[PDB]
Design a protein around this ligand. Structure first.
Ligand SMILES: *[C@@H]1O[C@H](CO)[C@@H](O[C@@H]2O[C@H](CO)[C@@H](O[C@@H]3O[C@H](CO)[C@@H](O)[C@H](O[C@H]4O[C@H](CO)[C@@H](O)[C@H](O)[C@@H]4O)[C@@H]3O)[C@H](O)[C@H]2NC(C)=O)[C@H](O)[C@H]1NC(C)=O
Ligand SMILES: *[C@@H]1O[C@H](CO)[C@@H](O[C@@H]2O[C@H](CO)[C@@H](O[C@@H]3O[C@H](CO)[C@@H](O)[C@H](O[C@H]4O[C@H](CO)[C@@H](O)[C@H](O)[C@@H]4O)[C@@H]3O)[C@H](O)[C@H]2NC(C)=O)[C@H](O)[C@H]1NC(C)=O
Ligand SMILES: *[C@@H]1O[C@H](CO)[C@@H](O)[C@H](O)[C@H]1NC(C)=O
Ligand SMILES: *[C@@H]1O[C@H](CO)[C@@H](O)[C@H](O)[C@H]1NC(C)=O
Lengths: 392, 391
């Protein structure tokens, strides 16, 4: 009973990101009797061809992108979606999505911007990262004028949020005598850069007659919807300037309920000034939060949406089944992870059926004996599980 | 012969510097003429506060100028109202929001913004949140003593009604110039220039860059802006990508998951990826969206818009005489946008009805008096007065 359809031993990761000097190689391995042949394709289901010095298919089936020149860059190659297909006589199955992105060595700079504060009011200096280079660039550490710096590596005064921003506990004219620059790390080449300018604190002495933020003439409230992976640290921003120091109360909405509740403050969950930090996010943390700002004059609130993503996975049951002619045949897709955008089924590398979690065949015919796959797509990643339908 | 009716009401907002005085007028009418009484937000009568507020002979509250140390919140920041009454009953004027402003130390900034060659840039003037209400952007100033004010769209350099500066089809030639924002304080007229000169740092495109989005994290923002009716709006879709993307603005509608293409015209203008609306109306309050796209990928920046129109209420009939035992009826017409809630009053106290039409099954002796329709929204209020006579 060694005869069986193909199954993926190793699927490449959903994200392959590399540089032009680095080059890259993608491995795809499958089993089953006879050993299936490995083949690379695109979204439309056509086999990818070789390209000189750019895209190679090695003897043992693999996708090789050699290191190339910035001029040799071709989008339809270097920014593309690929999929691995394994097949033998019994049937064929397609891998999950593989997003290949070859970054090049670019020029970018960051700058720390100055922020206005008031005595007694905390604040945050940020690091401007160009939006285009911001995906592969995050701040390694902040710095102080004489150069002794602060990593995640003591008196809580300066807190570094997981967002890579410097927090300052309360404030005082003593604080504005310092300047800071943020250093950043490229997660591809590992190259580092100091920010173009040292950020500074301008501290305003108040008198009276001021309420937090809002607007009287115009403008808006910013609803910031943000997502953080499971097991990752979140951040929720409630920066404001008021008179005198106000109260910050974090709240949360439950699943469409307009009734706002209290946020439990744990050793894992800290309200800091008005800024909330969560460690090790999970699906339950997903929801919209609220920050109530009131001093004696009243106020207005920061609305924030949180969505915790978890890595996608798929399992089909039964993994293999043999049913006679005329009977029903049923497949059940069992998946985990968030968010789940679309669900779909495939047959020998062909789209079939609806988006339903359960694929059913009323009367199984002889032509139905190929491989069946279940695909769960997401805004970011995807995944799938194979299966085999034999006959009797 | 008749009850109180307002001749001249006070306004919704009075904003004034401490260095400037201020006053609010309430004229009333009636037969006999009603007495005028000013009241706090809680309905309590206000007295003379020396040097801060005094009640003038003419039936108007006068706030004289004051030193910042004499500021008192229970006076200088509050909602007042004007109650006028006579034998037959009482009425109350629309809420009057009174905010006195002290001149506060501040400074502005023009910050650099990073872009890709061929993409469009928008430079912002940083205005601290606290004075941001009274401080707005007059013009932008370059290093040449040139300048940019607003206008009545196809040019490279253009100033947005939001007080920002849009630049189209950028190239290295653009980063060769700095910029400073000219601001104006509307209560005083103080003028400044941003202490820092904003420049443009440009990056030569090398290889494919999808629209902004995020792969790791934060930065997807829904801005919900409100602009007065007849005013000019600004709808933003910041993006930086290579090759240069294109921007399609769309419009959601009530209770819909879907949208439709914004129809461009002489009234509705698209500058690069930025959408501008002027001479707008209530119908122009949708929930908008812009979709950025290029040969790589795409992104959507979502924006909610609210156009506000001045609230004005009415009642018909303004007066009716009813023989005891029959029904009274009061219909209330209102306008202005939006409408948050509605309330009713009797001789200066809330009866607690939330609906436009007010009926009374059995009219009695005590039921005779003055009835008022009260409509409001977040920033504004409006009232309508009605009298009831007993036959
Ligand atoms: C992957 O792509 C990157 C980006 O294009 C590429 O790095 C580049 O390599 C080229 C060489 O092929 C560099 O070109 C220059 O060539 C002149 C001579 O023609 C040299 O003088 C240059 O040295 C400069 O170095 C300093 C900057 O670091 C300058 O300030 C100095 O004055 C010299 O001008 C340089 O060698 C090009 O500068 C780099 N650019 C970057 C951003 O790295 C890399 O080689 C590619 N990988 C491959 C092909 O495997
Ligand atoms: C409304 O309130 C505003 C602000 O509260 C107020 O404007 C202020 O006017 C006063 C003067 O009337 C200004 O006070 C000056 O401020 C400096 C500090 O910046 C002080 O050091 C000055 O004192 C000098 O003068 C002395 C001699 O008189 C010297 O011997 C001494 O060494 C100092 O040099 C001076 O008091 C203040 O700066 C402004 N503030 C603003 C924001 O404009 C305004 O007058 C009020 N309106 C009224 C009262 O109608
Ligand atoms: C807080 O401010 C909100 C306005 O944003 C207001 O509705 C609420 O009553 C205030 N609560 C307290 C306790 O100040
Ligand atoms: C535009 O981008 C959206 C996602 O932001 C995508 O769904 C759509 O297909 C794109 N359209 C074009 C023409 O690129």
């Amino acid at each position: 009973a060694d005869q069986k359809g193909p199954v993926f031993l190793k699927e490449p990761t959903n994200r392959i990101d590399f540089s032009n000097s680095t080059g890259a190689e993608i491995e795809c391995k499958a089993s089953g009797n006879p050993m299936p042949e490995i083949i690379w394709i695109r979204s439309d289901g056509t086999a990818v061809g070789d390209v000189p010095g750019l895209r190679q298919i090695s003897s043992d089936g693999k996708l090789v992108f050699p290191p190339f020149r910035a001029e040799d860059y071709r989008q339809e190659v270097h920014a593309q979606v690929y999929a691995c297909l394994a097949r033998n006589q019994f049937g064929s199955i397609i891998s999950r999505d593989v997003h290949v992105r070859a970054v090049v060595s670019q020029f970018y700079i960051t700058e720390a911007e100055n922020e206005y504060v008031i005595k007694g009011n905390a604040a945050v200096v940020k690091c401007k990262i160009p939006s285009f280079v911001a995906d592969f660039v995050q701040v390694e550490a902040w710095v102080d004028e004489e150069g002794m710096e602060l990593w995640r590596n003591y008196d809580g005064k300066y807190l570094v949020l997981p967002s890579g921003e410097l927090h300052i506990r309360e404030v005082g004219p003593e604080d504005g005598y310092k300047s800071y620059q943020c250093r950043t790390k490229h997660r591809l080449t590992g190259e580092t850069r100091l920010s173009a300018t040292k950020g500074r604190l301008v501290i305003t002495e108040p008198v009276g007659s001021v309420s937090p933020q809002l607007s009287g003439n115009g403008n808006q409230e910013h609803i910031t919807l943000t997502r953080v992976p499971k097991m990752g640290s979140v951040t929720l921003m409630c920066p404001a300037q008021a008179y005198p120091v106000p109260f910050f109360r974090w709240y949360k909405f439950i699943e469409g309920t307009t009734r706002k509740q209290a946020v439990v403050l744990n050793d894992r969950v800290k309200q800091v000034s008005g800024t909330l930090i969560i460690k090790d996010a999970v699906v339950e943390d997903s929801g919209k939060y609220l920050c109530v700002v009131n001093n004696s004059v009243g106020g207005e609130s920061v609305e924030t949406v949180l969505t915790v993503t978890a890595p996608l996975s798929a399992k089909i049951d039964p993994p293999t089944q043999t049913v006679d002619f005329g009977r029903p045949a049923v497949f059940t897709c069992q998946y985990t992870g968030n968010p789940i955008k679309t669900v779909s089924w495939m047959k020998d590398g062909k789209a079939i059926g609806h988006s339903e979690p359960v694929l059913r065949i009323e009367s199984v015919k002889k032509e139905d004996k190929g491989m069946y796959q279940c695909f769960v797509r997401n805004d970011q990643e995807s995944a799938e599980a194979s299966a085999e339908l034999k006959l009797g």
